[PDB]
Amino acid sequence: NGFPLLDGGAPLLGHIAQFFRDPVSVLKRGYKTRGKMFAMNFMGQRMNVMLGPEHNRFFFEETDKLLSIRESMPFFLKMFSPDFYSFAEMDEYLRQRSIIMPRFKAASMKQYVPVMVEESLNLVEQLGDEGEFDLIPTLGPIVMDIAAHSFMGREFHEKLGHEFFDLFRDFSGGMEIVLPLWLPTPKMLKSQAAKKKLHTILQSWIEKRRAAPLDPPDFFQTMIETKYPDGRPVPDEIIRHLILLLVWAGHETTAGQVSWALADLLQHPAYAQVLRDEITGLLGGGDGGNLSWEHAIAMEKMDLALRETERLHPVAYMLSRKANADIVREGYTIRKGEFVLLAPSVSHRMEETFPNPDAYDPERFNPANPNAQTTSNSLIGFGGGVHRCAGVNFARMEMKALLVILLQNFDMELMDEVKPISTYWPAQPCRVRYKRR
């Protein structure tokens, strides 16, 4: 019946402890020894992994039909609500998604670039003329500054920014597990407590700005005044959930992804020089404070670098669904209720799709390359289909801004070898030595 089973499973535990220790290597061993469809054994549960563009297309296409999203993160419901976004019924999901999409399509990035540039320059200021910085701990707070400043406004970021960021780390803990009596980790209580406080703080700011509006409107003003397509008003609670969702969905992902991207550049000086020349051609000298959206969109080699870092180090190293019904696929049956996985980390390094898959070669995405590797559903570090990452343009633009400003200001080198760890981040410490240019 089932997907071909990966061998080497331990008694009782199966592969789960191996996965615990190094998930991508477990996933790669499935590709190398079993192929594009294989089962892992997680404590007696079959985990059905599919690889490559055809299976990726199927996974995205069948989400909300044969494949269920909610069981990938059931306690999203408690962080947010059972009627919110991808957890809501189809009609309601689409209505709420219609609030988000116009604010995050590629055209809409004009809005956000000045805040991205300003906070990047604040980072340059904090770093000074020379020193060393740890990647994730340094860039994480900047990603968060950009999120809060962009989606809540400058004033909120100055006045309430400190209290807001502390509640978020607790809020983000709300995906906790349990101990043998089904006794819970503290973290779920702290997450609930932070959620209630985040909601009161956000509601106060909604009321503040509706009493005292900012015209012309920023993101926040437009958000709290938006209605659904049919004309009905968007409930305040939905607004609050949406904003928290954006900050949550974009925080640890972007901080890790951009850290991988800088690391890739610092390990490939020839291409970093390609990037420095593109930035210099567009911006001239100086600290990069003149970086505009119009400059940004012209940065074609930066775009290639960001695609290549996504390919080599997708922080979304695995994606997850549960089957709503039995699925027969190429002779194997996924049973109803079993997990179904994509693995961007492994799919992205299939020689069948990406020749020389361990090489850093951004020009493989250049459409003028006859050898180009741009088939649809082959680069899936942002998902796909209806449930593609809503922030994919915001994330790529923010990485571009952070890297441009850092490249323009600093000579940099990696101090440590990079190491691993859904979530795939450089192992701390991953430090950069720098000296201002």
**Contact partner at residue 257 from its own copies, ligand HEM, none, CB < 5 to 8 Å by partner kind:** ligand HEM
Tell me how far, at minimum, the Cβ of 306 lies from ligand HEM, in Å.
Answer: 9
In angstroms, how far is the first alpha carbon of the chain from the final one?
A: 62
The candidate with the shortest Cα–Cα distance to 4, out of 57, 40, 43, is 40
**Contact partner at residue 250 from ligand HEM, its own copies, none, CB < 5 to 8 Å by partner kind:** ligand HEM
Q: Is the peptide bond before 213 cis (omega within 30 degrees of 0)?
A: no
Among 274, 299, 315, 327, binds ligand HEM (CB under 6 A): 315
Say if strands 45-50 and 67-68 run parallel, antiparallel, or are unpaired.
unpaired
Question: Closest CB to its own copies among 171 and 317?
Answer: 317
Stretch that binds its own copies, among 109-117, 153-161, 389-397, 419-427 (CB under 8 A): 419-427
Distance between CA atoms of 258 and 12, rounded to whole angstroms? 38
Question: Closest CB to its own copies among 78 and 154?
Answer: 78
Q: Where are the extended beta strands (E) located within 271-323?
A: 319-323
DSSP-assigned letters across all residues of 181-235: TTEEPTHHHHHHHHHHHHHHHHHHHHHHHHHS--SS--HHHHHHH-B-TTSPBPP
Per-residue x/- track, 387-426, ligand HEM (CB under 6 A) = x-xxx--xx-------------------------------
Stretch that binds its own copies, among 68-76, 241-249, 290-298, 354-362 (CB under 8 A): 68-76
Q: Which two tokens stand for residue 168?
A: 């978020």
Is 220 one of the binding residues for ligand HEM (CB under 6 A)? Answer: no
Among 1, 8, 12, 325, binds its own copies (CB under 8 A): 12
Whether residue 90 contacts residue 64, with contact meaning beta carbons closer than 8 Å, is answered with yes
Is 254 one of the binding residues for ligand HEM (CB under 6 A)? Answer: yes
Question: Closest CB to its own copies among 203 and 320?
Answer: 320
**Contact partner at residue 44 from ligand HEM, its own copies, none, CB < 5 to 8 Å by partner kind:** its own copies
Is 86 one of the binding residues for ligand HEM (CB under 6 A)? Answer: yes
**Contact partner at residue 86 from its own copies, ligand HEM, none, CB < 5 to 8 Å by partner kind:** ligand HEM
Distance between CA atoms of 112 and 105, rounded to whole angstroms? 12
Say if strands 410-414 and 431-436 run parallel, antiparallel, or are unpaired.
antiparallel
Tell me how far, at minimum, the Cβ of 284 lies from ligand HEM, in Å.
Answer: 29
Residues 6+ apart with CB under 8 A from 124: 287, 405, 406, 409, 410
Is 182 one of the binding residues for its own copies (CB under 8 A)? Answer: yes
Is 249 one of the binding residues for its own copies (CB under 8 A)? Answer: no
**Contact partner at residue 118 from ligand HEM, its own copies, none, CB < 5 to 8 Å by partner kind:** none
Q: Which residue is nearest to ligand HEM (CB)?
A: 391
Q: Which two tokens stand for residue 85?
A: 């976004």
User: How many other CB atoms are found less than 10 A from the CB of residue 203?
Assistant: 14
CA distances (Å), 140 to each of 36, 172, 206, 240, 258, in order?
A: 34, 14, 26, 22, 10
Total count of residues recorded for the chain: 437
Q: Which residues of 19-50 are buried (b: 16+ CB within 10 A; e: fewer)?
A: beeebbebbebbbeebebbbbbbbeeebbbbb
Question: Closest CB to its own copies among 152 and 244?
Answer: 244
Number of residues that bind its own copies (CB under 8 A): 41
**Helices of type H across 153-186:** 154-171
Stretch that binds ligand HEM, among 119-127, 241-249, 271-279, 323-331 (CB under 6 A): 241-249
Number of residues that bind ligand HEM (CB under 6 A): 22
Question: Closest CB to ligand HEM among 293 and 394?
Answer: 394
CA distances (Å), 418 to each of 134, 172, 296, in order?
A: 12, 25, 28
Question: Closest CB to ligand HEM among 11 and 285?
Answer: 11
Tell me how far, at minimum, the Cβ of 171 lies from ligand HEM, in Å.
Answer: 16
Q: Which of residues 276-315 bind its own copies (CB under 8 A)?
A: none
Per-residue x/- track, 324-363, its own copies (CB under 8 A) = -------------x--------------------------
User: How many other CB atoms are found less than 10 A from the CB of residue 318?
Assistant: 22
Which residues lie near its own copies (CB under 8 A)? 10-13, 16-17, 19-20, 23, 42-44, 70-75, 77-78, 82, 87, 175-185, 188, 317-318, 320, 337, 421-423
Which residues lie near ligand HEM (CB under 6 A)? 72, 86, 97, 245-246, 249-250, 253-254, 257, 315-316, 319, 381-383, 387, 389-391, 394-395
